Design a protein around this ligand. Sequence first.
Ligand SMILES: N[C@@H](C[C@]1(C(=O)O)C[C@H]2OC[C@@H](O)C[C@H]2O1)C(=O)O
Length: 256
Amino acid sequence: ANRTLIVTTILEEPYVMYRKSDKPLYGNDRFEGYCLDLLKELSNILGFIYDVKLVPDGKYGAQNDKGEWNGMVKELIDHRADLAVAPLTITYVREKVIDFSKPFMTLGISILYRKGTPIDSADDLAKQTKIEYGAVRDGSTMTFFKKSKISTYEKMWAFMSSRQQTALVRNSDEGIQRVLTTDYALLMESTSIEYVTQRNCNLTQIGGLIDSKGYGVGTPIGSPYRDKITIAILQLQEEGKLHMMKEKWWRGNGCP
Ligand SMILES: N[C@@H](C[C@]1(C(=O)O)C[C@H]2OC[C@@H](O)C[C@H]2O1)C(=O)O
């Protein structure tokens, strides 16, 4: 039989979450979400079983000043996993070091905050001095700011980086808690903003999308699975299955 593929992933609602059960769950059964459904579909099409393993460092992946990676990206570079199936953003810097499938979803960075302020854009947010802001450490949103040559975003990066211990959060849950309990706005991806703002009516998006990009399945460079996964994604796309999966995991409207 074909070797069981190792899948690196990360907890991120509603892509990957612990299943709620009153009885013990083991192995893959512990998890559910859009990305687990995606894996069930991909594995049927490609003919494999898999072992889902949460990334040990809890990070998506960024490189330090020495060019050393962490998170799921490092797991792929180091051939610790066969696939990364997660809301993993397809970026220029990552594409040079891993192979991504074609995208299964598109999104852009925007701002999550509480309601009640006149802040209407990133320009507004960068200019004012009352509300702090940041991003999840070692993800693509942090990297977007670090690499930007747009003045507003360069200033925002300098601010986040100056207050890195403060401004850059460990994960999306910490970021959202910070938004809810302190004067802090979180830079994050639009599909996640859509999800949370339909569940907690104290939260809102500020402004529009600042960029546009996709999520893809990651594989190590040269992986014989990447093209097969791309073909499977296109199948699911064209059959309307990806659309159905989005509806299943995002439904339904909870806030005015
Ligand atoms: N998709 C990103 C990770 C992350 C980000 O950098 O925005 C962290 C986490 O942040 C909350 C929401 O944006 C979903 C997740 O995206 C990545 O692939 O690095």
